[PDB]
Design a protein around this ligand. Structure first.
Ligand SMILES: *[C@H](O)[C@H]1O[C@H](OP(=O)(O)OP(=O)(O)OC[C@H]2O[C@@H](n3ccc(=O)[nH]c3=O)[C@H](O)[C@@H]2O)[C@H](O)[C@@H](O)[C@@H]1O
Ligand SMILES: *[C@H](O)[C@H]1O[C@H](OP(=O)(O)OP(=O)(O)OC[C@H]2O[C@@H](n3ccc(=O)[nH]c3=O)[C@H](O)[C@@H]2O)[C@H](O)[C@@H](O)[C@@H]1O
Ligand SMILES: *[C@H](O)[C@H]1O[C@H](OP(=O)(O)OP(=O)(O)OC[C@H]2O[C@@H](n3ccc(=O)[nH]c3=O)[C@H](O)[C@@H]2O)[C@H](O)[C@@H](O)[C@@H]1O
Ligand SMILES: O=c1ccn([C@@H]2O[C@H](COP(=O)(O)OP(=O)(O)O[C@H]3O[C@H](CO)[C@@H](O)[C@H](O)[C@H]3O)[C@@H](O)[C@H]2O)c(=O)[nH]1
Ligand SMILES: O=c1ccn([C@@H]2O[C@H](COP(=O)(O)OP(=O)(O)O[C@H]3O[C@H](CO)[C@@H](O)[C@H](O)[C@H]3O)[C@@H](O)[C@H]2O)c(=O)[nH]1
Ligand SMILES: O=c1ccn([C@@H]2O[C@H](COP(=O)(O)OP(=O)(O)O[C@H]3O[C@H](CO)[C@@H](O)[C@H](O)[C@H]3O)[C@@H](O)[C@H]2O)c(=O)[nH]1
Lengths: 466, 462, 464
């Protein structure tokens, strides 16, 4: 029976903007208002240069902005008029106190919940859209229950999103699944159905999965944990390959041809990054500790410990290969983004590799085709330090890769940009100090090893014995 | 592409060797395939109407070519002598004493085969490891060969691991997800590899035959099983978290599995994985890591096992705590003893371990399984007096539950969801519990509560 | 105050059930009290002139009302059937195998009683745990009753722990510091609690009857014993420090105990506390804590036991070090085997442990106790007809035999007779150097005289 005609989305960020933009585009008869405290970001959504870069996003926004898609700072009225209110704010990791570095900080979710109840009457569906710790919905419900009004009936749902950087629009238009959690009560099921009906405008019913609220919240974190575990698992095998003479790409292919295991997310690397995996796994581990499930905690912690070991051993190879001394040695870092085809550096392995080398006094020359130089400088700087001394002494940002390798002892590939396999390595060899090393942290130079040895490089890569 | 295999000898007529070489013979009528073994009784059984291994389809495969191009014989020496390709298909059991006790593989049989092969061989042959071996096995075979060389003797060593699951061996051989062959990157090595590919190409598409180096091949078999076991431990770990929060493990498993990068197979929570492969292979991986000074990698894979161990123990603990932390002289029905449904195999079955935890509490177990022989259950629960005092093997599940305090489902036999639970309830002591260690009774919980049971299952909050 | 108990059935005719229900019958002539047990021999003994439990005053209490309103019988079913209040007074021994081995309580007997009670009951009854139980026991009984319900069957579950110390059971029952009763906060619960109070009000002042919730009641019994054991481990820990500094433990104990907030009882340093209560109950508390994810609390109480274990072990070590770290074939007199004086009970007695430490050194022990039967000493020192005991242990008929040709005299139990022995005589026939190790401070004041005779005399809490 219930039909959603007006949607408010609190938070115009990496999740809220694109998700609500696609909803508006697929549901012309639903008014969608995306709001945010940050005036400058709203203005950018209302501009020709969107604050988030994602392929296809511009054309989605432009097709319905001003018609049924709106971006505004008027949060109150947008809540007031809405049938469904999406909560799409960040829950950052606590930087102090109990659970420091692992527990989520619910301050913004809570502030939204309180603002919602303050500005609401009658019936609304309130839906968690950004990634939240398990039990977030219970907290929202508690705020609502404690701040009740006559005829106020707020229903709380979970609707996690599954966007990957660089494929957001394809992820929204053709998702593997849509996930919605709500209570097993009649009102709960009514709210769930209403949100399903929104998605049914473009997503087949058999791809919409409905669960209880807890299952939903837990599924998001668990899904990321399983993905991260695949990477840490094949990375663990890469270490074994180096020790034995096996080759991690051969092994990955053999394993992945078993259709029970599948062939995705088995690309060995110096280590996974991004703003999702580490944060979500660490949150899962904290949840387990809080619930007195230490065995489960220890089990998932291994995903992070392995990623840390993969980075550290890669850094150790480089340092050992240069005689355990890197003081004043020029080293080229090729790739700073957390993966290719993005400028995002969040939890990028390049930051950690770089930091290990800076602790050895290396002169790093860093090249990335898309990451802005100011971001590199921030990432490698000591917190609060506005003119950090180490970065100033040790870090150069190069404008091209040949500058970065000119007079270098080693070339360290940390991000799998396609352009790195196309470089003129003969030319690079000539102006490097000898012995000249290439450390391939992404297996991008596979099939070029003989070529590179013949030129005179010592070429090493993860998951291949030296 | 020059060398052509026309005669094959397989040393070992076991779970792996017999079926595999039978299928090869069936698919390659022009190749003579001779499977050999020291065990005379087993060879006779292969030559009989009652095969020593039960696998669906295997009888009809063997009967279609036995006596024509498929032979089973005790004459190991002449089989090797005549062969172009010699498969080594013997077990490498876990060491029961000494360095690596309980984890390291015992290469005695592989070594014996390697010595016998070089003793009975001249000229050119391809020698291929077919059963599961530790990484570096091929190096050992190669060392024996190199140390025992003859003029004109040219033996090539390959790895060709098996991917047979109990109950599906024939489908797994006729329609494999992939065939895996490893050999050296040398010209002789690559000729050996191509010769063996040509055998498989009689019925497997080229695109499903993967060739690697020897190490990659050996490591792939252990690793694949480690990944499969990890999926089970990972979802089992989520099952504990579901019990603590109100999330439901089947809901979470479905949600996770619909991500095509993760896939939807091997996400059925359980009391714990069993079988002769997973624990043995993971523990061998862990031991390899420790021997190579990779303690971080060792610890990472050990968690797969630790989690399995925890899943069993906490299941046992739920039962015991539910019965007031005393089980002395209490009758408990154990339904299911096999390590999975539709087999009689009990190796490393979770039912053994759950049963042993309850025996430690002095429970009177009444065990029912539709296929496991009673004498195996007795052996499994015996010390290498308690069994006699505490264990009864029931001939049907209603006997097992008659006067019982709890019904514990450990194996997912389909028949267990169809039992007359109203009848069972009547003759059980009260309070009457059902512990479903396989989620087979999903959807029946309201009904069972109405009858009067306390029904609990893994991955569901009480 | 409506409900009135007129018939009481007590399941378990043991150390707790017999005396407790005997006193009830003695103080409440108009209530019929029937004590029952599966052990026929024990019921006969309660119906005999030689009672199966020795406690001062107990004979005269039983004889004053047995056959009148006090009955001992093996007919458990009819006793339950007729009863208004059913006491459950069976043992809950420590689990000897499985989960919680050596610490968790085994509820088998409590459960068997609960099932038998519901089987033989109709209408209204009050069921009361009387023997010491782990926390949550009452919840278990309630679950069995709820699962095995009948029309008009209304069973109420209460907790009523006992506080009897070996040797003072009758005084502890007639003149208790308090009576403790727990039950639910519901109206039916409170009516059951008041009904049981009314029984005690026949001889205990209302102000000494404390009513609580069921959990508080169960936990109070364990906790009270934990506090008492903690006082002994605390003063014993001070005894070690005294030996290290020249302070004297009896001086310190006196000084501490004169603070009225601390009190002056249970501050007698010793080789270590024993008995069937303290170790068992503290270890059950520790287990409960672990099961509830309270490891800090678990560690906190475990220290009471670890300190008792240390006190014993360091005492044994003093002896062994003093005899040059070799005791093989050396004759050593153990004076005192009971867990405290004025009893034959040896359960968890420090003498057992001290003796075992010396047997592992190959000592020839000659053990004297004025009340412990020899057969019990042999059982206590045997492996669960033992070889070690046979080779190494002699049970002496008198203390002069035990000390004849001995290297050391080890006092482990504070029997009064040990301070009045002829130590000059003992000295003459001991091997030299002759030692006395006083594990109970019974020879305080005699040290100069003993040194003059020629002994090396050492005691806990006194620097050498
Ligand atoms: C947010 O919850 C989002 O998280 C994932 O998307 P990301 O934006 O984090 O990108 P990816 O998941 O594609 O890459 C993440 C890191 O993993 C490394 N990686 C990936 C695959 C592989 O085989 N090896 C490997 O190292 C990448 O290089 C990155 O460093 C998730 O995919 C989304 O579903 C999710 O919503
Ligand atoms: C030997 O190398 C062989 O190992 C596996 O075969 P299995 O005979 O062991 O059969 P399964 O893999 O089917 O069963 C293993 C156990 O895991 C449990 N399980 C399985 C899936 C799941 O979702 N949950 C779960 O608990 C089963 O109940 C079994 O107890 C392997 O399959 C073969 O590839 C390999 O050759
Ligand atoms: C049962 O719960 C019962 O347990 C206690 O009674 P006990 O029968 O155990 O005797 P005591 O408590 O008198 O003595 C116990 C052990 O402590 C030693 N002790 C005592 C006091 C002291 O200052 N120092 C010391 O070493 C004794 O020598 C015994 O070995 C409890 O008293 C009862 O309330 C309880 O109900
Ligand atoms: O009280 C508040 C707090 C925050 N915000 C706004 O909420 C938006 C949040 O944007 P963002 O930081 O991108 O958070 P999310 O959109 O939740 O996305 C993050 O988390 C995702 C998965 O959950 C990752 O995929 C992304 O890369 C990562 O940026 C920001 O614009 C904030 O200004 C408000 O309007 N009000
Ligand atoms: O010189 C010889 C000649 C023959 N054999 C025989 O080798 C055969 C081996 O058969 P089997 O014991 O069944 O080993 P596998 O075929 O390798 O199978 C084992 O290991 C598999 C994984 O590799 C599991 O799937 C199986 O359940 C498990 O039995 C036996 O018949 C032995 O008699 C020798 O050991 N030495
Ligand atoms: O199903 C059963 C089991 C036992 N009994 C009898 O119950 C009595 C149990 O009494 P007992 O073994 O003496 O236990 P309690 O009376 O609880 O006394 C023990 O526990 C006390 C701590 O509270 C200590 O003070 C005592 O020394 C110690 O014997 C025995 O006669 C048993 O035969 C039954 O009637 N039915």
């Amino acid at each position: 029976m219930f039909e959603i005609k007006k949607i408010c989305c609190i938070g115009a960020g990496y999740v809220g903007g694109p998700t609500c933009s696609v909803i508006a585009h697929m549901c012309p008869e639903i008014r969608v208002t995306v709001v945010d405290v940050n005036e400058s970001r709203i203005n950018a959504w209302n501009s020709p240069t969107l604050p988030i870069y994602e392929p296809g996003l511009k054309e989605v926004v432009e097709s319905c902005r001003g018609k049924n898609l709106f971006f505004s700072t008027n949060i109150d009225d947008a809540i007031k008029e809405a049938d469904l209110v999406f909560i799409s704010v960040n829950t950052p990791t606590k930087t102090y106190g109990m659970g420091k570095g692992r527990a989520a900080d619910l301050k913004y979710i809570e502030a939204c919940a309180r603002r919602i109840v303050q500005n609401s009457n009658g019936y609304k569906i309130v839906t968690e859209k950004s990634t939240v710790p398990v039990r977030a919905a219970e907290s929202i419900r508690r705020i609502f229950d404690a701040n009740t009004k006559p005829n106020l009936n707020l229903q709380v749902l979970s609707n996690p999103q599954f966007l990957a950087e660089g494929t957001a629009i394809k992820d929204l238009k053709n998702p593997d699944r849509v996930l919605i959690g709500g209570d097993e009560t009649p009102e709960g099921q009514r709210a769930v159905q209403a949100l399903c009906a929104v998605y049914e405008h473009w997503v087949p019913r058999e791809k919409i999965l409905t669960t209880n609220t807890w299952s939903s919240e837990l599924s998001k974190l668990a899904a990321n944990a399983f993905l991260a575990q695949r990477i840490s698992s094949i990375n663990s095998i890469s270490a074994l390959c180096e020790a034995t003479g096996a080759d991690v790409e051969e092994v990955a292919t053999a394993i992945g041809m078993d259709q029970r295991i599948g062939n995705k997310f088995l690309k060995a690397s110096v280590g996974f990054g991004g703003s999702c995996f580490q944060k979500d796994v660490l949150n899962l581990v904290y949840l387990c500790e809080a619930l007195n499930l230490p065995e489960v905690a220890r089990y998932w912690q291994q995903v992070i410990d392995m990623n840390d070991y993969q980075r550290r051993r890669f850094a150790s190879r480089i340092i050992d290969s240069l005689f355990n001394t890197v003081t004043d040695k020029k080293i080229a870092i090729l790739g700073f983004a957390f993966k290719k085809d993005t400028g995002d550096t969040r939890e990028s392995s390049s930051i950690y590799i770089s930091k290990y080398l800076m602790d050895e006094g290396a002169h790093l020359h860093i090249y990335d085709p898309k990451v802005p130089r100011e971001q590199i400088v921030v990432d490698l700087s000591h917190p609060g330090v506005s003119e950090d001394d180490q970065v100033s002494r040790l870090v150069t940002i190069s404008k091209d890769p040949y500058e970065a390798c000119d007079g270098a002892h080693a070339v360290v590939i940390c991000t799998e940009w396609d352009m790195f396999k196309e470089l003129d390595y003969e030319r690079i060899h000539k102006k490097m100090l000898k012995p000249a090393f290439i450390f391939d942290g992404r297996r991008v130079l596979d099939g070029l090893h003989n070529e590179l040895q013949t030129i005179g490089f010592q070429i090493e890569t993860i998951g291949k014995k030296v």
